[PDB]
Amino acid sequence: RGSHMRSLHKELQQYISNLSYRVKKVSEEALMQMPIGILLLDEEDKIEWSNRFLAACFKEQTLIGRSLAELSEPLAAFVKKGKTDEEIIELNGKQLKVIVHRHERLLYFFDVT
Amino acid sequence: RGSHMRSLHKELQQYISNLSYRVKKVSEEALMQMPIGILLLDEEDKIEWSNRFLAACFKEQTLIGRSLAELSEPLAAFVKKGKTDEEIIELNGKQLKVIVHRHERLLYFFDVT
């Protein structure tokens, strides 16, 4: 209900500069040092933008609109609490990195093969 | 000796877009959701670029040229091993976030008040 990604616009439009908005195959900068998957949501658990690479590497058909709890149960409570900074669990053999701050405006989760 | 940050140029020049190279006071986007301190080094323990904000919040005069071990002992062994992804310790009252990958070209440490 409370879209954060689309509540400021500039905030997200700022971060999504250095990287291509297409986020497909990431052949532009290669994948040997940078995150293999990126996920960005609102302040409730509704995903907004995500780098395709993660889904493919997770064996999914569509990760968007799949809420947070559906994707993972351990971090489901975490996204509903925000009383921490970062955490790295493991899924599909790769680590699942989660990160949140104060105003969790920059809250995101990445994958770590 | 082997400056990774200056070995590619484009690699670092790409990431340093969204944010101002000035990195002073961060009044541009504020500090209520984003990292309070940024640090980037080579593949040995020689720091190359860092956001001033971290030093100030650490009670330092100059962090650049202070190697890795001089700043912190726990992560000193870590920077020389690279057998992990991320870790968050605590220093000066804020969490100290460290992150490394494969080719640790994007290896960096952030502070988490």
Side-chain angles (χ1 to χ4, degrees), chain A residues 10-11 33 85-86 97, chain B residues 11 29 33 85-86 97:
Chain A
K10 187 197 187 293
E11 190 96 8
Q33 50 226 30
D85 166 36
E86 71 182 17
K97 170 197 313 287
Chain B
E11 196 93 18
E29 293 305 322
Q33 52 221 32
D85 168 40
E86 73 185 10
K97 176 197 309 300

Side-chain angles (χ1 to χ4, degrees), chain A residues 9-65:
Chain A
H9 303 109
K10 187 197 187 293
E11 190 96 8
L12 205 264
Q13 297 309 273
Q14 192 88 28
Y15 199 67
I16 58 172
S17 41
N18 70 98
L19 63 309
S20 6
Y21 193 60
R22 303 164 316 231
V23 287
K24 282 181 178 192
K25 289 314 188 81
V26 74
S27 322
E28 293 95 290
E29 223 70 47
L31 212 186
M32 50 177 191
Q33 50 226 30
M34 47 215 79
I36 112 166
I38 299 178
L39 197 153
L40 294 111
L41 71 150
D42 283 329
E43 71 156 287
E44 281 181 62
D45 96 292
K46 265 67 210 87
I47 314 168
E48 188 67 280
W49 194 58
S50 303
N51 290 24
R52 247 60 175 238
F53 334 111
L54 175 74
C57 308
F58 249 80
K59 281 305 187 68
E60 249 308 331
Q61 296 175 89
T62 175
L63 80 166
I64 39 172

Side-chain angles (χ1 to χ4, degrees), chain B:
Chain B
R1 281 178 133 82
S3 309
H4 259 245
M5 207 120 298
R6 288 188 223 215
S7 186
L8 299 91
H9 302 101
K10 185 190 186 299
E11 196 93 18
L12 205 271
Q13 296 308 273
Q14 199 80 27
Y15 198 70
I16 56 155
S17 37
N18 57 87
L19 65 306
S20 359
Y21 191 76
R22 300 170 312 240
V23 289
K24 289 194 180 178
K25 290 318 201 59
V26 79
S27 358
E28 293 99 318
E29 293 305 322
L31 215 169
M32 49 182 180
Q33 52 221 32
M34 49 213 69
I36 160 216
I38 291 180
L39 193 154
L40 293 113
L41 68 151
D42 296 312
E43 72 150 273
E44 287 169 44
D45 87 298
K46 256 59 215 165
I47 312 168
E48 186 68 279
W49 193 59
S50 310
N51 292 23
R52 244 71 176 224
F53 328 120
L54 178 70
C57 312
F58 249 76
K59 283 310 191 62
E60 245 309 315
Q61 300 200 87
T62 170
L63 82 166
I64 36 171
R66 197 95 301 117
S67 309
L68 249 302
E70 303 171 68
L71 288 174
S72 306
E73 305 168 328
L75 49 83
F78 150 79
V79 300
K80 236 61 236 88
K81 247 63 178 183
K83 275 79 205 184
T84 195
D85 168 40
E86 73 185 10
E87 195 82 88
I88 46 285
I89 61 169
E90 191 178 77
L91 271 171
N92 218 88
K94 312 95 96 259
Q95 312 305 280
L96 196 52
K97 176 197 309 300
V98 303
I99 298 176
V100 285
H101 284 358
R102 219 100 286 136
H103 283 328
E104 56 259 298
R105 239 170 291 262
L106 283 87
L107 95 158
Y108 36 51
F109 323 128
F110 302 154
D111 184 275
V112 218
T113 179

